[PDB]
A paper describes a structure:
D-cysteine (D-Cys) moieties are found in firefly luciferin, semisynthetic cephalosporin MT141 and malformin A. D-cysteine desulfhydrase (DCyD) is suggested to take part in the catabolic degradation of D-Cys and D-Cys-containing toxic compounds. The polypeptide fold of StDCyD is similar to those of other fold type II PLP-dependent enzymes and consists of a small domain (residues 48–161) and a large domain (residues 1–47 and 162–328). As in other PLP-dependent fold type II enzymes, the active site is situated in a large crevice between the two domains. StDCyD is specific for D-Cys and βCDA, and shows no activity with ACC, although it shares significant sequence identity with ACCDs.
Numbering used by the authors:
A (entry chain A): 1 to 328
B (entry chain B): 7 to 180, 185 to 328
Write the structure that this text describes.
Amino acid sequence: MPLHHLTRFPRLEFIGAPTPLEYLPRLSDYLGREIYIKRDDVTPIAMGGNKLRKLEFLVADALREGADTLITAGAIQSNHVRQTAAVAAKLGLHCVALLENPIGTTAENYLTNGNRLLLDLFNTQIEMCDALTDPDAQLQTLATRIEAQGFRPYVIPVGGSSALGAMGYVESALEIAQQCEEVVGLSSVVVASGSAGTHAGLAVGLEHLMPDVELIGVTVSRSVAEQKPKVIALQQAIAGQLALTATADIHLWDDYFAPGYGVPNDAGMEAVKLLASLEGVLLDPVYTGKAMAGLIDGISQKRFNDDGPILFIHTGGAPALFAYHPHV
Amino acid sequence: TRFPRLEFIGAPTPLEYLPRLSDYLGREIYIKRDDVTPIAMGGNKLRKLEFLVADALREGADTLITAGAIQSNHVRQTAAVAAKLGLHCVALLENPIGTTAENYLTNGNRLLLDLFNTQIEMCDALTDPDAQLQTLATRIEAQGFRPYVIPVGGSSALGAMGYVESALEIAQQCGLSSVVVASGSAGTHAGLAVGLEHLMPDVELIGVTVSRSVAEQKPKVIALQQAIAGQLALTATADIHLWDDYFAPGYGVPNDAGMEAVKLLASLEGVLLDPVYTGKAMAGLIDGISQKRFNDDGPILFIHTGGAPALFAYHPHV
Ligand SMILES: [Cl-]
């Protein structure tokens, strides 16, 4: 009932059915606590991912605006850029990508394999830059040039994280609440917290459908201090677009991303190895592996509110496994 | 329905209209998205494993053994399933193409095998898969384990039941004139053969071969077709159609027509095919239009059997 204004936003149909919400009996056995998993990694478009949920709203907005070109930005190994390019091809829209090498690697699989390989399969126009120091400003300059060629560009921010994009995860929260109804009482939810639209959309939805559930974001690029205002700003903007208040505090753990965004760490790689070997589930070195490492240590250090069921949001990211191998 | 089966997929996989590709080819093309399954990046082999692994549990196995190329999709899917169910996995692998390219040897499906904690046994060649798997099962059994052997490509009568099931989904989900599928170890072809004869008999089913000529491959598809039919107490009289022009110079080697099929589907539809199987099968479908090989001019159904992780293994070359 309280999420009905969500209906007013046009959206494309990229996913179809709700994504699986599954129990992880072997991980749970190992961790000594019930772990469930929301499989947003399993979507029908170009190897899937959370970003596709945001693109349903973003691209429908682009179509409504008469745009014929999608322009966005990210790392060379961005999942968002890859999903945006797959969607662009499918719809006969052009796609322009402003890419950066965030970790300064020269490893060939990072530079040419994984998500970056797929971009060429999608005929993505690639614009390289030294660094995304000011993505909104750099994306505009790029739009101006694209426009001078006669294209009608729609600019999507980094990670698809705008209030509109984040509606996709307000929607995901609705699925989660329905799937858990009379099946399991969730105590905590864990998701990776990057550009912040996924966290923020979950925050609004869960506040209204599942107010007792504790939502934890595991940062993948930022400290709590840098990250929290970004999540909050989106949270509030989302709530307003829906004519809702959002009074929930935002929780973030920043202990699991060192040495930095896009750099693998030992605990993140152990997390990937653990989910693959115990559950046949594929995480990634950049996002989900670090988030899972966060979940695992949280159980270990008693960081959660209690001993009840945890839901891990699988946001995707697996194509990056191939780019990060063998190293850097 | 007599055969016990594990639920790895659940919902029917999507069946879609490809309007951009259709527009380009001047023909109606549909796709069966069996590449979209929830387990370890998906694929057709998963449909087979629903039956083979159910069979394995019934016999109280604790270890699954199968064989394939280093970049085998089946082995990767078997290993993920094994990991999920708490079974050991032993894989017999060969290098079918004599490559030393780092990505073929260590990336793609092969990388996933390590993540899934697969035990790896290398052999010069899978000249006698049935017998080599048998030897492996013995040495594994003599170590205190209880092995269950899964054939190459998961292709046996039991395995192929997975594709009688897909045929039902196709029937439910569908003026279809033709169906195109890659024909390798043959369980998929033969499973769709049985299911489609009994549900869509007017539909022409074409297997595009990926490893063999029509002469070498037809008996394999037939043997399996007849076996599947017997097990379901049916008779299958429909003949097997195969095109073998699209796989040169051999199994697991990409060709230009297949790679350009991957490019066309990526750029037109945002769909990802692979260099070994579906790309080649799609090139056959396209050339089937070019040379008017199909029975008529009506809608074509392409079966996306999967294979995409091999894109990362085959890049940049060899
Ligand atoms: Cl334990």
